[PDB]
Each structure stands twice: as C-alpha cells, then as structure tokens.
Design a protein around this motif. Structure first.
Motif, PDB file in Angstrom:
ATOM      1  N   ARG A   1       0.809  -1.211   0.000  1.00 57.72           N
ATOM      2  CA  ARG A   1       0.000   0.000   0.000  1.00 57.72           C
ATOM      3  C   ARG A   1       0.844   1.265   0.000  1.00 57.72           C
ATOM      4  NH1 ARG A   1      -4.859   1.003   4.345  1.00 57.72           N
ATOM      5  NH2 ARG A   1      -3.251   2.419   5.153  1.00 57.72           N
ATOM      6  N   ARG A   2       2.099   1.192   0.451  1.00 57.74           N
ATOM      7  CA  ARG A   2       2.984   2.343   0.310  1.00 57.74           C
ATOM      8  C   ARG A   2       3.173   2.704  -1.153  1.00 57.74           C
ATOM      9  NH1 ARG A   2       7.337   3.849   3.804  1.00 57.74           N
ATOM     10  NH2 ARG A   2       6.413   4.832   5.653  1.00 57.74           N
ATOM     11  N   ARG A   3       3.258   1.698  -2.025  1.00 58.69           N
ATOM     12  CA  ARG A   3       3.421   1.951  -3.453  1.00 58.69           C
ATOM     13  C   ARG A   3       2.209   2.671  -4.029  1.00 58.69           C
ATOM     14  NH1 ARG A   3       6.901  -0.211  -7.136  1.00 58.69           N
ATOM     15  NH2 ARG A   3       7.604  -1.750  -5.594  1.00 58.69           N
ATOM     16  N   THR A   4       1.007   2.218  -3.669  1.00 60.41           N
ATOM     17  CA  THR A   4      -0.201   2.723  -4.314  1.00 60.41           C
ATOM     18  C   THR A   4      -0.418   4.203  -4.025  1.00 60.41           C
ATOM     19  OG1 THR A   4      -1.228   0.534  -4.221  1.00 60.41           O
ATOM     20  CG2 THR A   4      -2.685   2.435  -4.504  1.00 60.41           C
ATOM     21  N   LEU A   5      -0.245   4.617  -2.769  1.00 62.86           N
ATOM     22  CA  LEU A   5      -0.599   5.981  -2.394  1.00 62.86           C
ATOM     23  C   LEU A   5       0.397   7.013  -2.905  1.00 62.86           C
ATOM     24  CD1 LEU A   5      -2.289   4.156  -0.439  1.00 62.86           C
ATOM     25  CD2 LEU A   5      -2.295   6.114   1.114  1.00 62.86           C
ATOM     26  N   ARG A   6       1.525   6.586  -3.478  1.00 61.47           N
ATOM     27  CA  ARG A   6       2.463   7.549  -4.048  1.00 61.47           C
ATOM     28  C   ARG A   6       1.796   8.380  -5.134  1.00 61.47           C
ATOM     29  NH1 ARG A   6       7.340   3.614  -5.821  1.00 61.47           N
ATOM     30  NH2 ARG A   6       5.650   3.232  -7.317  1.00 61.47           N
ATOM     31  N   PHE A   7       1.055   7.726  -6.030  1.00 62.26           N
ATOM     32  CA  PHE A   7       0.361   8.455  -7.082  1.00 62.26           C
ATOM     33  C   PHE A   7      -0.773   9.291  -6.507  1.00 62.26           C
ATOM     34  CE2 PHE A   7       1.896   4.844  -9.909  1.00 62.26           C
ATOM     35  CZ  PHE A   7       2.900   5.605 -10.474  1.00 62.26           C
ATOM     36  N   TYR A   8      -1.381   8.827  -5.413  1.00 65.91           N
ATOM     37  CA  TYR A   8      -2.431   9.606  -4.764  1.00 65.91           C
ATOM     38  C   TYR A   8      -1.887  10.922  -4.223  1.00 65.91           C
ATOM     39  CZ  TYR A   8      -5.949   5.862  -4.875  1.00 65.91           C
ATOM     40  OH  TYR A   8      -6.877   4.924  -5.268  1.00 65.91           O
ATOM     41  N   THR A   9      -0.711  10.885  -3.600  1.00 69.22           N
ATOM     42  CA  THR A   9      -0.151  12.082  -2.985  1.00 69.22           C
ATOM     43  C   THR A   9       0.190  13.124  -4.043  1.00 69.22           C
ATOM     44  OG1 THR A   9       2.045  11.054  -3.014  1.00 69.22           O
ATOM     45  CG2 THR A   9       0.750  10.865  -0.976  1.00 69.22           C
ATOM     46  N   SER A  10       0.101  14.394  -3.651  1.00 71.24           N
ATOM     47  CA  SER A  10       0.410  15.526  -4.519  1.00 71.24           C
ATOM     48  C   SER A  10       1.455  16.391  -3.829  1.00 71.24           C
ATOM     49  CB  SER A  10      -0.848  16.336  -4.825  1.00 71.24           C
ATOM     50  OG  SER A  10      -1.509  16.714  -3.630  1.00 71.24           O
ATOM     51  N   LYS A  11       2.689  16.337  -4.321  1.00 70.80           N
ATOM     52  CA  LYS A  11       3.743  17.182  -3.778  1.00 70.80           C
ATOM     53  C   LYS A  11       3.425  18.646  -4.056  1.00 70.80           C
ATOM     54  CE  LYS A  11       8.812  17.592  -3.701  1.00 70.80           C
ATOM     55  NZ  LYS A  11      10.036  17.423  -4.533  1.00 70.80           N
TER      56      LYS A  11
END
Lengths: 106, 213, 129, 329, 27, 51, 30, 229
Positions: E5-15
RNA sequence: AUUGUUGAUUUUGUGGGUGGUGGUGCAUGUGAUGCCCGUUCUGGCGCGCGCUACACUGA
C-alpha cells in the motif's frame, strides 16, 4: 452495506514524473503538462501503454501508471523511433562607414 | 472650541499615530523616504521597508478632514519611531501634497515647533498619558483581536469619558507598540486594514454614535 | 460534529437573537450513547467532537500540531495513512534525536532550594530522599 | 576541582569544566542508586549540595550538560528495551527531577525535556504496575510530569490511563469496569483498613527498594492527592473535561461506597460536580474562518516609460536604402 | 502489506499577498 | 450538477442545473408530467425541478 | 525579559526565532 | 436542521467586472479626474512640479492635481467593501477618458510611483499584472452608462443638496439594483459634471468634505448597510 | 613576550568598562548644560496601406 469497488475511486490529482497532473483532464492532455512531453508524444506513450484515450487521468489504474512511467523513461527499449525523439557587428560597422561616405558625397 | 491637551474634562476622541516613521537626514536635512533615499538608509543600516512617512501623511489628511474634526471633537498625536511625541493642532490645514508636507515636518523636527502669524504643530514631552484626558478609554487596533462594531463600542462607553486609539503607522510590525499604555486591543474588521482606512472607519463610527453628522 | 453553525455568535445579530442564542446554550445535552451497540442508533451525528479539541493541548509539539488541523480549513484531499500507522515510543525518541532543526537548550530562572521534600522551595512535594 | 580549574587560570579549562559538568551529573545519579538508608541525613546533605553545584555549572556549561542529559535518556531507553522495569532505578527518578531544576520545562519543544517527557510517559503506559514498588515508582513519575507542566498545563493522556488502573487496582474487579485492563488482581486493599488514621502520603525513595497495608494506603493517598491537583489545574480547562473525568467519577464513587469513613474520594468527588455544574458544555465551533479578501496583484509597468542587433541591423538598412534611392534619382 | 500500500498511495499524494500598507516591490 | 441531454445527441446540452454542492445520486423524470424533473442529493432534500 | 521569553517559548517560539510548526516538516513522512 | 455546505474552505469572492450586470455592488465614479501627460520624457502633469508647462498650455494650474485621485483610489481600494468584492471604481478624466479599475489592483502607495503608472496607462491603454494573468487598469469607451449595471441608481455628491444618512439611503434601496456615486475629484467646480447621467444629487455632510473623505464616508455606510464589517 | 636587530613597550587564554579631537541650541568662557547621534587610492520617429489572431457559427 459493504461494497468495495475493485478499480478504485476517481483520483482528482496524481503525481507522475515529479509533476502534478489533474484527474479531470484526459490522459493524453494531462500528461502533456509534463515538460518534454508534447501532444503527439503523450498520444504515442498512451498507445504503447495500452490505455484507452477516452479515460480521464484520475480513471487510470495503477499498473497503467507504472507502464506509462516505464515507457517514458526508456523510449528506445520500446521501439520509439529515433526521429520522433561578431560578423554581424562587422557588417553593421561597414554599413555605418558607407552611410558616412554617402553623407560625405551629399 | 479648539480642543487642547491642557483641557481634560471635555469628552473627545484622541488618535495617536504610533510608530510614525518621520526622521530628518542631511547628506541638507530632508525627510527620509523609502523611494527617494534608498542607498542613504542602507548606510544608516536600517530596513527601507519601514521608512514610510507617507503613511503618517495620509492618516493626517483623513483625520483632519473628517467631519468630526470640523466639529471640534478630535485631536491628534504622533509618536515617532524614535520616541518623539508631536501634538497636532485641530485647526491646522497641513499641506495636501507630500513634498510640501516633508518640508513642513523637517522644519518641525529641528525648530521643535511650528507657529503661525497657538503652535499648529508642537513637539511635547513623553509619556502620552500625561497629556491624555484624566478619564479615558485606551484601545489599539489589532487584526488578531475580536472584531467589534465601532458604533456600539462608543455608545456603551460613558459620556464624561473619552476614547484614545493607538493606530500603528508602520508598514508592517507587531501590534505591541502601545501595549503598556493600553488596557485592551480591539479588532475593527475581518480584513486587514490600512492605517488611513482604520482611523477613517473609527472616525465614521464616532460620528454616527455622537450624531455629529 | 466538528462545528455546529447554529451556536456561532455574529456581531450584527439583534438583541432578540442574542437572547435566543443564550437559551439554546442552556438546554443543550450531549446525546451520544456510549453503551449502545448499534452504530446507526448512537446519535453520534447529533453530538460534537470535544475530544479532538483537547488533543490540541497535547504535550508533544508535533501531535498538538496535527490536532490543530481540525481548526484549519480542509484543503488537503486526504492523508496518507501509511505515514502515521507504524509509530512507537521508540520511533518518537529516535525521531527526536534525528531532528533536522537543532535548537539551543534553555534554562530555568526560577530557583528551588531542594529537589525533594523532607520526610524554602521544594520542586517535588510529596517525594522524599 | 572547580576552583582549581577556573577558565582564567589556563587555556582549555572551559572544556575541562564542560566535561566535569557531565561527570558531576553522572555522580549525582550514581550516589542515589547506591544504598543510603543507614545515613539518610548524611546523604541528604551531600546530594542536594552537589545539585546546587550542578546548577551553577549549567549556567555556563549547559551545552555540555545537555549532551550528557540526552545520552542518558538514550541509555534509559536502551536498558528498558531489554530489562523493562528491572533496568529502572532510583537514579532515573532523581535524574528526571534534576532536569526540571536546570532546564525550562514550560516550552513547546526542548532538547532535553521532550525526550524526557516522552520517555516518562512511556513508563506510565508500558510498565505493568503489578507490584506495590512498581506503583510507587509510577506515583513519583506522575508527580514529576505534573511539575513539568506546572505552567504549561498540557494534556498528558498517560496520566489519565495511569490513574484509572491504579484506582481500580486497589478495589479488586467490581464487574462494572471491564474497559480498564488491570495487570494484577492481588493488590486489593482489605475491607478492614481504617482510612481514618493520619498516614504520611510522602513516598521516600529508599523505601521502594525494600518493598504492607499501611504502605499500600500511603501510596494510594499520594496518587489521589496528585489526582486532585490534576483536576483543579489541567483537566478543568480542557473542553473534554466531562469525558476525561467520567471514568474517574465511577472509580471514586466505588471508594466512597466501599469505605464510608474514607473522605478523600468524597472531597475529590464533591469538587467534581462543582466543576461540571459551572462549566458550559456547548457544541464546539472550530471551522469559523475569517472571510478571505479578493486577490491583490501588483501592476507591471516601466519606471520611465518609452512610447536583437540583427533586427537593429535591418532597421538601419531601411534608412540607408531610402537615402540611396533618393540620391540615385 | 505496508510496502504494497505504500506503493499505491504515491500516485495519490500531490507534492506541493499584499495586506495593509505593504507597498509593491521596488526595482 | 444535473445535466439534461437529448438522447442520441451527446453534443448539445439542453439544460444544466446545479441542484446542490453535494452529490446528486438520483435524477428521475416525472412519468406523468414531462416538464418536471426530480433530483435527490446528499443534501437530503429532493428538489423537484422544472425544465 | 526572562518572563517574556518564557511566555514566548511556551507559545511555540523556538530559539536556534522559528516556530513549532517549522519542526513539523518531514517529521511524519520519515 | 439545514445541512452544511459541502466545502467550508473560504473562497475569495468573485472580482466584479463591467461585463457582469446582475450582482449588487458599489460603483464609485471619480469624475473630473485631472490625469494628463506631456513630453518634457513623459510625465503626469502636476500643479506643483510643472507650473510653467500648464501655463504654456493655457490650462489653469488650480485644476491640475492628480494627487486627489491618488488619495481617493487608496481609500476606495483599501476599504473593506472592496475586500468583500462588492465595489468597482471608474475614473472619468477631465479630457474625456474613462478608466476601469480592477478591484484586484494594488496601486503604488507613494504618489511618485503612481504618476509613472498613469503615463503607462494613458499611452499603452492597459496595465497587466506582474504575473500577467489579467488587466488591472484598462481604458474603456465612453459613455459610462453602457458599462453600468442594467438596474442601477445614480447620484452625485453635491454640497448644496439635502444631507442624508448614507446608512438609511442604501437600506431603503432595492436589492436587485446597485448604486453609482459620481464623486468630483476636482478641487473646486460646479457639481454638474454628471448631471446628464444622474437622476438626483445628495449631500452627505453639512460641512464641506474632501473627495477622499466623501467617498470613504459613503462606503462605510454601505459596509454597515450590507453587514460587510 | 615581542619590535624593526630590540628588550618586557608586546603576545596568548578568561572576564570586562566604555557611545565621544560628536554635534546642535540654552543660560556671563563656564555648566555632575537640555536635546539627540574617519584614511588613502582605483574606475564611472510622424503620417499611411495590406494581412494574421484573439475559438465551439470553433480546433
């Protein structure tokens, strides 16, 4: 009461190649926002990644996103064609000398 | 009658333009400016952000031109950032343009008094409290403080009592210039306000409260 | 739950509205049932979240700042759970040592004569050597 | 040693005293660990005298002292990972107290206090508290953290958790508190306890190593005296005071019912309704934000308004052509 | 499970404002 | 937003109404009357619109 | 002065005068 | 019982523009503004800095004061009514030039930098943001009535006219409508500059008032009237 | 120790007092006066035509 959709929810914003891309925009024209990614390049990357161009950027599942990143980072490996990827001052000084010469004659 | 610091009984509305950035400097003595003199203020080692006597000029134009001052119910004081306290005669009609104002203040800071032929502007001795009325409410203008209706505030205020406001003429800074004199700080609007606007608002409220019209 | 707009005070509100607001405050009672087993019947939606407000005074500076988020506008779309789940007391101490920003140690001007109580000033009344 | 090595007598004495400040602190805690019941008066004369000396050093060498303080906090944590309570000693209790003397506890962040306050709170939550010695050790910790927050008055959830189980520990369950998890059901006080004699509430540190009913009662009274202080200083201000105090009302209610002569719970109890009566428990309103003004953008313009060279070269050719053509004609 | 799940939420996050009497920048 | 389109003509939008800021899950035409359209939203109010 | 500094530090003033919110950058992420 | 708005994050209210005619707003028209340039470079003519040039032009130097419009703009644009996005300002120069002021503009506080802006505006016909995403001051076409809202109340600030309370006047006025006040930025003159547009003229104070004070006194009534605070 | 040979004049470590060939006025120079807060070189267009855009009647 418990319904969990396999594909996932609509992503309003996404992070690809250290760039924020809006979910509301279509995949091709959302990827265009990445520097060095043009309209035709993004269209080709989507075609290689096998992503339906009618989808929104948020609609994309995960594996399509890693696939797009992989195509972009290694274009040659997936057969993206190569074709797709003082003197003037001297002339000015000559002109000024000539203009002075004409002023001399007149 | 022209209200004066000597009189302490009449209910009036004092405004103190604290942190006023009025200074004279000679290369001849001239009022300092954020734009006319930039290198010079660097040599003095100060920030050019807080070098704005135009803020104090605009506040005086709106304060002196207000209908209340025409009614003789307002007198102004200026607390320079150096601690120099200046008393402004309500009858004065200061110059409208700033360059003529700068020439007037530089005369003031050296001659210590402007006289007409009563001193229209006179430098006085600090602290402000000695000059302020014996019975008086002291407040400051704070963005962080609760917002209040100026009409209601003055109305619930007593009749023999007067109101002092310490308006900050600085461009930017902490609202603690007048903290030790004052007993409470009040906000006047949800949006941040300019010094000229703030005293104009507090001027308009007094006129409705006291029916100056 | 985070806020009931009916309980907010407006400076322009008329004196009758002030009186009406005061009566509403006196009659309020928290309806949340802690013993009810049905989550659809606990009346939680009609209650309020006072507990999260108190966490804004938590002794740990970073936990207090997180709790303060409920007082700030909800700009963020979501929070990554994986960045908050697996924390321990050990991790908090280790994170404290590996702090990016290094500060100066302060000292106490107040003076206590004795650290422990007897069996002028005592720092720990109720404890003795 | 301080006098012989003042900074002025020779170069390098600041560093030597800087290290001696750390060495002195390790001595203050070291002596407390050593057994001293034989000569408590003599120990009390040396231990506080050394602390007074240590305070003078800290004024000049806080940075050296701070580094040693943070290393010890790491050492206590490391020993706790392997031995749990067996690592903990009287020196740690003394150590946490000295830090309060020498450093400003009422800071939102501090180099030494915040690790200490996290480490202390870990003990109040992780340690089992299945023996009278262990509870007495915790009773001291509640006093230290309370003195840390003597001005800040910040909320420590572990203190709430600690008070619940200790109060329930001495009543063992009544079958009405199943949400509280005890770690020892054999510490219950007997029904024959008087609760009217004058029993000292002070916990001497040397008694902990020795650690029956009288000691149990004295520890209990100290814990409740801290509870009374926490209610009147910290919890009353919090918006969730009613929620924080509700489990404690039931526990103190049990004490009064079980021991009628016992007065301390009733005084804490009677105070509590008084607070809940006055306090107004209205819905909170936190999302009320000030209106945001319309944006403000500065104007772009030229200071001295005027109504590359290849373009300039072409521009001059045009004029030279025009002169030539007129000349030729 | 964290890594998955660490992998999946990377695209969710917005820097990844003038107020009061602030004057527009000088140059 | 509740959007009304002509069937078989996706391009032109006959009518666009903003029922509420919350999601609108149900949008049903009245069977007996063609003019009026019903919308139910998470606002918990089922507004009855007219085209 | 010392009393005022203690009040400032109580409210989040961190002396290196930063704030507590500054320390909360990257803390939870790593 | 009413459900809350979905998003409570505070949003900046819309910036009023002349295109939008429906919303109720405050229009303030600084008529008879004295704004004119001249080559020396081009400089905004002043009554004090340039006295000979205005004599050469034959135009009186009493009526050569752009500082009044500078003072009127600062008090108007810094007012809370502007911050609430309920006020838009126009300027009718004496020469016959109409200027529309974006509510979002942040005009320079000092007069020297204000004069440099106007020569840019009067020649380039527009001013763009530093980030360049709107036009802050654009010269528009006369007459003013076209740009004003379809339902709008017009009035002028005349000393001789009956004194009214700006509070009572706006409250008694309708809700779909909006209000224009033609303020005279001129130092002295007949209050007939806006006679052909307006329907009536009102006084606000029995004593004479400066233009900056007269407009500021009018808006503060609108804020209290509309609860802008 | 240190100077540029010289001889305790300096240097090093730790503390630490100072606004002062400072101005400007006031009172028959003086005032425990009020008030505030340098050195030497090196550079310094006007008047006129035509076309393209500013999108959904569009790309």
């Amino acid at each position: 009461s418990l319904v969990v959709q396999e594909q996932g929810s609509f992503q309003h914003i996404l992070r690809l190649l250290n760039t924020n891309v809006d979910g509301n925009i279509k995949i091709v024209y959302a990827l265009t926002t990445i520097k060095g990614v043009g309209r035709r390049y993004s269209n080709l990357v989507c075609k290689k990644a096998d992503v339906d161009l009618h989808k929104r950027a948020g609609e994309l599942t995960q594996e399509e996103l890693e696939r797009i990143v992989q195509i972009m980072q290694n274009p040659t490996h997936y057969k993206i064609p190569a074709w797709f990827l003082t003197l003037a001052n001297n002339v000015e000084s000559k002109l000024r000398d000539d203009l002075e010469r004409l002023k001399k004659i007149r | 009658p022209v209200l004066t610091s000597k009189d302490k009984i009449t209910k009036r509305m004092i405004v103190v333009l604290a942190m006023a950035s009025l200074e004279t400097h000679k290369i001849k003595y001239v009022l300092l400016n954020c734009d006319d003199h930039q290198g010079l203020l660097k040599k003095m080692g100060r920030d050019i952000s807080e070098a704005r006597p135009d803020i104090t000029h605009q506040c005086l134009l709106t304060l002196l031109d207000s209908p209340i001052n025409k009614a003789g119910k307002l007198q102004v004081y200026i607390q320079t950032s150096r601690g120099i306290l200046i008393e402004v005669n309500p009858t004065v009609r200061i110059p409208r343009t700033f360059k003529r104002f700068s020439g007037l203040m530089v005369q003031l800071l050296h001659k210590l008094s402007i006289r007409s032929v009563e001193k229209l502007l006179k430098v006085i001795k600090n602290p402000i409290t000695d000059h302020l009325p014996t019975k008086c409410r002291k407040v400051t203008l704070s963005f962080d403080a609760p917002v209040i209706r100026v009409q209601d505030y003055i109305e619930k205020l007593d009749d023999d009592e007067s109101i002092c406001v310490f308006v900050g003429a600085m461009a930017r800074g902490k609202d603690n210039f007048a903290d030790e004199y004052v007993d409470e700080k009040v906000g006047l609007s949800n949006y941040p306000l300019s010094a000229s606007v703030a005293c104009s608002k507090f001027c308009h409220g007094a006129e409705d409260a006291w029916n100056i019209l | 739950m985070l806020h009931n707009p009916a309980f907010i005070s407006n400076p322009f509100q008329t004196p009758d509205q002030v009186a009406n607001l005061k009566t509403l405050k006196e009659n309020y009672v928290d309806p949340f049932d802690v013993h009810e087993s049905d989550p659809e019947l606990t009346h939680a939606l009609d209650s309020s979240l006072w507990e999260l407000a108190s966490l804004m005074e938590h002794y740990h500076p970073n936990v207090a700042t997180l709790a303060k988020i409920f007082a700030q506008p909800f700009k963020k779309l979501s929070y990554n759970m994986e960045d908050f789940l697996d924390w321990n007391y050990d991790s908090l101490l280790n994170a404290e040592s590996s702090r990016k920003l290094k500060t100066l140690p302060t000292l106490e001007f107040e003076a206590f004569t004795n650290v422990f109580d007897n069996e002028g000033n005592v720092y720990l009344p109720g404890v003795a050597w | 040693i301080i006098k012989a090595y003042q900074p002025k007598l020779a170069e390098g004495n600041k560093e030597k005293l800087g290290k001696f400040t750390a060495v002195l602190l390790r001595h203050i805690i070291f002596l407390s660990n050593q057994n001293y019941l034989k000569n408590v008066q003599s120990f009390k004369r040396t231990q506080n005298a050394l602390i007074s000396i240590l305070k003078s050093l800290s004024e000049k060498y806080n940075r050296e002292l701070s580094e040693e303080c943070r290393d010890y906090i790491n050492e206590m944590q490391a020993r706790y990972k392997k031995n749990h309570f067996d690592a903990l000693s009287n020196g740690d209790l003394v150590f946490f107290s000295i830090i309060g003397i020498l450093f400003s506890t009422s800071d939102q962040y501090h180099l030494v206090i915040t690790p200490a306050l996290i480490l202390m709170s870990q003990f109040l939550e992780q340690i089992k508290f299945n023996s009278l010695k262990r509870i007495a050790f915790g009773a001291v910790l509640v006093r230290i953290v309370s003195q840390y927050q003597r001005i800040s008055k910040r909320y420590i959830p572990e203190v709430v958790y600690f008070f619940q189980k200790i109060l329930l520990t001495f009543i063992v369950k009544p079958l009405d508190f199943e949400n509280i998890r005890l770690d020892s059901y054999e510490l219950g006080l007997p029904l024959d306890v008087d609760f009217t004699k004058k029993r000292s509430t002070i916990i001497p540190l040397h008694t902990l190593s020795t650690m029956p009913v009288d000691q149990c009662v004295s520890v209990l009274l100290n814990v409740m005296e801290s509870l009374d202080a926490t209610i009147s200083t910290v919890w009353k201000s919090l918006p969730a005071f009613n929620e924080i105090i509700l489990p404690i009302q039931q526990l103190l209610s049990a004490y009064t019912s079980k021991y009628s002569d016992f007065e301390k719970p009733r005084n804490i109890l009677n105070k509590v309704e008084k607070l809940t009566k006055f306090t107004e428990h209205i819905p909170l309103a936190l999302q009320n934000h000030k209106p945001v003004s319309i944006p403000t953008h500065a104007p772009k313009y030229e200071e001295n308004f005027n109504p590359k060279m290849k373009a300039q070269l072409k521009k001059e050719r045009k004029f030279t052509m025009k002169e030539i053509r007129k000349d030729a004609k | 499970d964290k890594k998955a799940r660490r992998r999946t939420l990377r695209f969710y996050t917005s820097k990844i404002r003038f107020k009061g009497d602030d004057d527009i920048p000088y140059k | 937003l509740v959007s009304v389109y002509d069937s078989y003509n996706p391009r032109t939008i006959l009518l666009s109404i903003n029922a509420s800021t919350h999601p609108t899950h149900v949008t049903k035409f009245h069977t007996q009357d063609n003019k009026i359209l019903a919308t139910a939203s998470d606002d918990r109010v089922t507004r009855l619109w007219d085209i | 002065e010392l009393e005022q500094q203690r009040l400032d530090r109580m409210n989040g003033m961190i002396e290196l005068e930063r704030g507590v919110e500054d320390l909360d950058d990257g803390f939870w992420e790593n």
